[PDB]
Amino acid sequence: KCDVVVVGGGISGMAAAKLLHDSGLNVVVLEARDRVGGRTYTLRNQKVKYVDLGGSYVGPTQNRILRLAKELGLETYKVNEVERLIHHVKGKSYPFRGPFPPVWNPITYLDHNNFWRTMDDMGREIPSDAPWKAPLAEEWDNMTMKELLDKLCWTESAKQLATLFVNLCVTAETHEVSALWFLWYVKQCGGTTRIISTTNGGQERKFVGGSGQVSERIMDLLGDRVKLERPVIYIDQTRENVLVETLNHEMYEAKYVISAIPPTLGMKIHFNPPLPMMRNQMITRVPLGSVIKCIVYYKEPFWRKKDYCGTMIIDGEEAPVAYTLDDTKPEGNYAAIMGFILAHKARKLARLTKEERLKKLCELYAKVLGSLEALEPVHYEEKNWCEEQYSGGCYTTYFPPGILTQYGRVLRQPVDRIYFAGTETATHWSGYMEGAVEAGERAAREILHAMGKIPEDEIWQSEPESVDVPAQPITTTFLERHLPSVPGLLRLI
Amino acid sequence: KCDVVVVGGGISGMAAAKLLHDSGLNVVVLEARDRVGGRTYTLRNQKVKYVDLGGSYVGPTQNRILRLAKELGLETYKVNEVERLIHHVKGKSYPFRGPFPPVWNPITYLDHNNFWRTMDDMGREIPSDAPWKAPLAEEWDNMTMKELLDKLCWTESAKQLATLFVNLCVTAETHEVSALWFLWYVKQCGGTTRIISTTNGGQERKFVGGSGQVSERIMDLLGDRVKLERPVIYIDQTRENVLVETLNHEMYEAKYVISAIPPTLGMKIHFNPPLPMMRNQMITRVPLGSVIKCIVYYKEPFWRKKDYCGTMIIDGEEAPVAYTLDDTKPEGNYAAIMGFILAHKARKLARLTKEERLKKLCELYAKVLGSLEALEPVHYEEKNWCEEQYSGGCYTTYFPPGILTQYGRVLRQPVDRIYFAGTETATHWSGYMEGAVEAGERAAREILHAMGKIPEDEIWQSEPESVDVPAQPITTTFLERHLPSVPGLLRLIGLTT
Numbered sequence: 005k006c007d008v009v010v011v012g013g014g015i016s017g018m019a020a021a022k023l024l025h026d027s028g029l030n031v032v033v034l035e036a037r038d039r040v041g042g043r044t045y046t047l048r049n050q051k052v053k054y055v056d057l058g059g060s061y062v063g064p065t066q067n068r069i070l071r072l073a074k075e076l077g078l079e080t081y082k083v084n085e086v087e088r089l090i091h092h093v094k095g096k097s098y099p100f101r102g103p104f105p106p107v108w109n110p111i112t113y114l115d116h117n118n119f120w121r122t123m124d125d126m127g128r129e130i131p132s133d134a135p136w137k138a139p140l141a142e143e144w145d146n147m148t149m150k151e152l153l154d155k156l157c158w159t160e161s162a163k164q165l166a167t168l169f170v171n172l173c174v175t176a177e178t179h180e181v182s183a184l185w186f187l188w189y190v191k192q193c194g195g196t197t198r199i200i201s202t203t204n205g206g207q208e209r210k211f212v213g214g215s216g217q218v219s220e221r222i223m224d225l226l227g228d229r230v231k232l233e234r235p236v237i238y239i240d241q242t243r244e245n246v247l248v249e250t251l252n253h254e255m256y257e258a259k260y261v262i263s264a265i266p267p268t269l270g271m272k273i274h275f276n277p278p279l280p281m282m283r284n285q286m287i288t289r290v291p292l293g294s295v296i297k298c299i300v301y302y303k304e305p306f307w308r309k310k311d312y313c314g315t316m317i318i319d320g321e322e323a324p325v326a327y328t329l330d331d332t333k334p335e336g337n338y339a340a341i342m343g344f345i346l347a348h349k350a351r352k353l354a355r356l357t358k359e360e361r362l363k364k365l366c367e368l369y370a371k372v373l374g375s376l377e378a379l380e381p382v383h384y385e386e387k388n389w390c391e392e393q394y395s396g397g398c399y400t401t402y403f404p405p406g407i408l409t410q411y412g413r414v415l416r417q418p419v420d421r422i423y424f425a426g427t428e429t430a431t432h433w434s435g436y437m438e439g440a441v442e443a444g445e446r447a448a449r450e451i452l453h454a455m456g457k458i459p460e461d462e463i464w465q466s467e468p469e470s471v472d473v474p475a476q477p478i479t480t481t482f483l484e485r486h487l488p489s490v491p492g493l494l495r496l497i
Numbered sequence: 498k499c500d501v502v503v504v505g506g507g508i509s510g511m512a513a514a515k516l517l518h519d520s521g522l523n524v525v526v527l528e529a530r531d532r533v534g535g536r537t538y539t540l541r542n543q544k545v546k547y548v549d550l551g552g553s554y555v556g557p558t559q560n561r562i563l564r565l566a567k568e569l570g571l572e573t574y575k576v577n578e579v580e581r582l583i584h585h586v587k588g589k590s591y592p593f594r595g596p597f598p599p600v601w602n603p604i605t606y607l608d609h610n611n612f613w614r615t616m617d618d619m620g621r622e623i624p625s626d627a628p629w630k631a632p633l634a635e636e637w638d639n640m641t642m643k644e645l646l647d648k649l650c651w652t653e654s655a656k657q658l659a660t661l662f663v664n665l666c667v668t669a670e671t672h673e674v675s676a677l678w679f680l681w682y683v684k685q686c687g688g689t690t691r692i693i694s695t696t697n698g699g700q701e702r703k704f705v706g707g708s709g710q711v712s713e714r715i716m717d718l719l720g721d722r723v724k725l726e727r728p729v730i731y732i733d734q735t736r737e738n739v740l741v742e743t744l745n746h747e748m749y750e751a752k753y754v755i756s757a758i759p760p761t762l763g764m765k766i767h768f769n770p771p772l773p774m775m776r777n778q779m780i781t782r783v784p785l786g787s788v789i790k791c792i793v794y795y796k797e798p799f800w801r802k803k804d805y806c807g808t809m810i811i812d813g814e815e816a817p818v819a820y821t822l823d824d825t826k827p828e829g830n831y832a833a834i835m836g837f838i839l840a841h842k843a844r845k846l847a848r849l850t851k852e853e854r855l856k857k858l859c860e861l862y863a864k865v866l867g868s869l870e871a872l873e874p875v876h877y878e879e880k881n882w883c884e885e886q887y888s889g890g891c892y893t894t895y896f897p898p899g900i901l902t903q904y905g906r907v908l909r910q911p912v913d914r915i916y917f918a919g920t921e922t923a924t925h926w927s928g929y930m931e932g933a934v935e936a937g938e939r940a941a942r943e944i945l946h947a948m949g950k951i952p953e954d955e956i957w958q959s960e961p962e963s964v965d966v967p968a969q970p971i972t973t974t975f976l977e978r979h980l981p982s983v984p985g986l987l988r989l990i991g992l993t994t
């Protein structure tokens with residue numbers, strides 16, 4: 005028994021556990037599996053030395069995990085983006101530089117340009133704070149991303165790219181998801197460019213040694229306080245001190261509980277009293293994406309000799325993987341290529357043996373890169389989050405049509421003495437590790453204010469720009485921002 | 498410890514507990530609350546005598562619950578449909594007879610006609626057995642019912658009626674739901690007419706005294722074997738006998754477990770080993786509807802004197818309730834009007850005090866019936882399932898866009914020795930009580946075949962027509978089935994010639 009019990013073992017949890025504890029409070033972290041990273045997990049073994057099988061990239065805009073990571077003595081390193089990149093469409097590879105693949109036909113350049121531009125216009129109107137307050141909230145929330153794309157794109161080229169863009173960020177199908185939501189999501193990281201970018205944004209760097217380290221080291225900083233194998237089963241706010249209880253068959257009491265489960269996973273616990281109605285149902289409507297992350301390892305980074313860094317953007321159904329990044333260690337060390345198997349594909353491809361899938365991955369790469377070499381892997385590693393009981397799937401939680409709108413404002417409303425962290429709770433970079441920190445921190449601070457050691461003021465707190473990962477702003481073009489849409493051009497005539 | 502553990506206390510479970518037990522097997526029903534009715538619950542108290550707060554109607558098509566009901570000595574009674582009915586639109590009531598409200602405008606008579614006609618054409622094409630197998634499964638599954646109506650309906654009159662038709666049957670918004678799914682649902686009951694009808698189909702009869710009876714009585718036939726207050730928390734197939742465990746802190750073991758939790762509510766349990774990928778994620782994408790059931794009681798059934806039985810179909814937002822049935826006991830006894838608060842409205846009006854809601858319903862009724870009398874309730878009763886931890890919501894589970902298609906075929910794939918009941922699992926009338934029976938029974942039988950006391954043959958079993966609720970088929974009209982759509986008419990117009 006203690007002061008405050010935290011229900012998740014992952015980054016948001018620990019971040020929060022620590023904040024509290026750096027603050028004198030007596031904390032305890034109930035964590036359900038033997039490891040402690042979140043959807044964050046770092047394999048270590050001679051063949052690979054280390055690989056993030058969970059989440060790794062981290063960037064310019066993400067001032068907080070950067071910071072936390074530093075305090076625990078960790079270091080960044082940039083991802084390879086020196087050579088050229090590839091957009092392989094209709095069976096051929098086309099190389100290029102810069103964040104964005106070039107388009108040929110004017111009546112298409114116009115389209116694409118409108119597409120993204122429009123995503124951003126549409127977002128500039130959604131408070132991150134609270135998406136459900138947008139002038140057009142409902143209209144956008146009762147529509148599906150596919151609907152939007154269908155309405156928005158006069159060219160197939162664009163319709164597909166956008167699909168992919170989407171398949172790629174969040175984890176599912178243009179048809180699986182609320183427009184209002186997805187629109188929110190992108191903006192809440194600073195829009196298209198920031199998010200899609202390797203170099204001046206989202207996927208610039210990985211952490212030396214693994215993002216796993218983040219939470220392990222906080223565990224180290226915490227005493228015995230972090231209890232592994234402690235699936236929390238049952239929470240009771242009935243009396244005064246709160247009781248939490250473990251599948252284990254032990255009890256803990258405190259005067260507060262932060263929960264860092266991904267929202268759905270709340271169903272995993274039995275509450276008494278019952279949750280208020282909105283929450284109770286909300287927990288039931290907000291699932292997780294599906295993805296298998298895969299890493300194929302070669303003797304050296306053969307791509308570079310062909311003046312490709314290993315970034316492939318790949319169009320089409322026949323392809324197991326649509327996006328690929330270089331995963332070689334910072335030293336020229338373990339040549340590898342990283343790749344995601346998204347959404348429906350993640351479920352189709354699951355049935356194959358690991359082996360069967362490597363063949364597929366390779367063959368693809370050999371073809372896209374154009375090099376027999378890819379046919380000669382030297383080691384493979386993959387994780388399929390789909391199958392994880394205590395995670396539910398990967399990257400994040402998505403919102404289907406009906407929902408942000410109706411159940412949205414509940415996600416982080418406190419229930420008596422339970423407050424709620426978790427990346428899916430953030431406001432910046434939710435969905436990503438940074439999110440997961442802002443969350444926990446904001447949470448815990450909520451509890452502090454409750455206990456009276458701090459004002460409304462200091463629940464929400466600012467993000468001092470890191471010095472190691474400075475951020476430069478986003479640039480537009482008179483042309484880029486006044487060319488007509490395909491319709492405009494039509495009306496112009 | 499025992500033979501087979503069943504996880505739900507509701508109709509599917511009991512139905513199934515029984516079947517097994519009628520068969521010599523050593524059963525046990527772990528149920529989580531003090532009661533035992535499903536999303537089936539019967540209030541009892543002088544003011545009311547009894548009222549189903551949960552699910553009550555039952556009808557011509559539903560050959561099994563009728564039957565079980567009978568074996569336990571229960572009796573049907575038809576619901577009032579002698580007087581006329583009302584379609585209240587744009588603020589006026591229009592009375593009528595027959596299951597279907599009449600429409601003025603031909604250019605609209607045609608539309609409606611096509612609307613429903615289309616729903617059935619569209620469903621003659623989806624094997625109930627396995628909806629995901631339709632020639633156009635995907636296309637229809639990545640579409641939302643709102644899209645379909647939008648695409649399908651050339652007239653507001655129709656778009657609105659249809660919307661309501663949906664808000665009503667399932668329990669969500671045209672935009673929350675998969676076309677493919679909803680289509681499936683309707684057809685899996687035998688289509689529009691069967692389903693919408695009071696008299697010759699869906700809502701013909703209530704049981705006397707309450708549906709609750711059904712499951713209680715089985716609990717009676719069952720020994721102590723039914724354990725209330727036993728939230729199952731944890732199920733372990735690791736070894737050989739399976740262990741299930743209660744929040745209570747006691748353990749049962751068996752050689753099979755039937756689960757009768759509505760699917761999502763699986764999450765409620767910790768599995769080891771972990772459920773296979775698909776199931777693990779499916780449990781998570783398939784929620785329930787939202788609805789508050791409401792019953793207002795009057796001195797006598799005043800509407801009848803006005804030659805209305807109290808069936809109100811009510812269009813518009815300004816309305817807390819869109820469908821209303823007479824609930825007066827079969828004797829002329831407790832004058833009452835039943836009504837549903839659907840979908841978004843369920844959540845909007847939830848904030849109001851019970852009181853605030855009564856004023857609202859009444860006022861509503863007073864205007865629609867046109868009768869100061871309704872301003873004079875003599876007692877009120879209401880349930881809001883939205884707030885129920887061990888149910889999730891009401892009538893049933895719905896599938897959003899992505900999903901029947903992908904995670905569908907798992908709903909009832911067994912996992913080692915866990916087999917899966919619950920209405921959400923049926924093939925007929927799923928979503929309804931009948932369903933829940935077909936499920937449970939079929940389930941159990943699945944286990945029988947496992948143990949080798951029965952062949953593949955007898956897992957799925959047929960449905961002998963009730964004598965007391967005989968069923969007559971669905972009737973079409975040369976005209977009904979050849980009038981053009983508003984498009985057809987358009988294309989017909991060929992001034993060219």
Ligand SMILES: *[C]C1=C([C])[C]=C2C(=[C]1)N([C][C]([O])[C]([O])[C]([O])[C]OP([O])(=O)OP([O])(=O)O[C][C]1O[C](N3[C]=NC4=C3N=[C]N=C4[N])[C]([O])[C]1[O])C1=NC(=O)[N]C(=O)C1=N2/[C]=[C]/[C]=[N+](\[C])[C][C]1[C][C][C]=[C][C]1
Nearest residue numbers: 012013014016036042043059060061236398427435436437
């Ligand atoms: C999975 C993943 C992947 C695969 C990938 C990725 C990721 C992921 N990410 C995301 C992250 O990870 C997130 O954000 C985080 O992690 C979250 O965290 P949190 O909040 O904490 O949650 P978690 O972590 O999970 O934790 C949880 C915990 O809890 C526990 N439990 C449960 N239940 C329970 C418990 N206990 C007791 N009782 C009970 N019941 C569990 O177990 C745990 O422990 C990401 N992120 C970042 O940042 N980075 C990266 O990299 C990532 N990744 C990704 C991304 C992708 N991208 C970027 C791509 C792209 C491209 C182009 C465009 C766009 C995008």
Ligand SMILES: *[C]C1=C([C])[C]=C2C(=[C]1)N([C][C]([O])[C]([O])[C]([O])[C]OP([O])(=O)OP([O])(=O)O[C][C]1O[C](N3[C]=NC4=C3N=[C]N=C4[N])[C]([O])[C]1[O])C1=NC(=O)[N]C(=O)C1=N2/[C]=[C]/[C]=[N+](\[C])[C][C]1[C][C][C]=[C][C]1
Nearest residue numbers: 505506507508509535536552553554729920928929930933
């Ligand atoms: C709710 C409802 C309402 C409100 C209404 C209705 C309904 C309902 N219904 C439906 C029914 O209810 C269903 O189907 C059934 O009941 C189901 O059952 P099952 O299968 O078994 O499931 P349940 O019952 O829920 O059971 C469950 C059990 O389990 C338990 N738990 C949980 N969790 C747990 C447990 N244990 C251990 N552990 C754990 N974890 C619980 O508690 C329980 O016990 C219906 N149906 C019929 O048949 N009828 C009727 O009436 C109904 N209702 C309605 C309907 C409506 N309508 C028809 C209307 C319309 C109009 C026009 C057109 C169409 C429609």
